[PDB]
Amino acid sequence: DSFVIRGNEVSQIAPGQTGNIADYNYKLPDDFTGCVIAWNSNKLDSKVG
Amino acid sequence: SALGKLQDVVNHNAQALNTLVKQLSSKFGAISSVLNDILSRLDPPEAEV
């Protein structure tokens, strides 16, 4: 599953963690097995303005 | 105390049940003894342990 989030919210994609992206728009179970890979990319995402 | 044996069997049985029922209030190290509070004031990851 691939998407883009803000900087300080990468911590919320984890089993059992409550927040604003975890309880409202992307939620993974408590028995999750697998893993997450997040790499800062603001060289292709932030425009002037 | 002529009837010590019969009285003693009765008292031992009653005391055993009493201690078994009373020990439900003990916490055993958990933050609270009632299950409801544990499931109310804590997220599932910590409520498990």
Side-chain angles (χ1 to χ4, degrees), chain A residues 1-17 19-29 32-49, chain B residues 2-42 44-45 47-49:
Chain A
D1 316 329
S2 70
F3 53 95
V4 167
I5 42 171
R6 217 213 300 277
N8 46 349
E9 302 290 355
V10 174
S11 84
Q12 291 195 7
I13 58 161
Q17 186 159 357
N20 188 284
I21 68 183
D23 47 359
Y24 276 145
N25 45 333
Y26 181 72
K27 150 81 172 167
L28 58 94
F32 172 74
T33 87
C35 44
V36 303
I37 303 168
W39 73 89
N40 169 291
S41 172
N42 92 325
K43 184 194 75 70
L44 295 73
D45 272 1
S46 56
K47 310 205 180 142
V48 60
Chain B
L3 284 304
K5 299 174 215 181
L6 314 179
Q7 187 60 39
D8 184 320
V9 68
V10 168
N11 292 343
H12 283 187
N13 294 137
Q15 193 178 68
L17 283 172
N18 220 29
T19 297
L20 186 63
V21 169
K22 219 183 186 181
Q23 194 165 356
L24 286 162
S25 89
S26 174
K27 289 186 281 287
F28 301 96
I31 60 168
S32 180
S33 53
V34 166
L35 283 297
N36 289 144
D37 303 3
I38 297 293
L39 293 101
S40 71
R41 68 179 177 181
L42 268 184
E48 302 324 305
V49 68

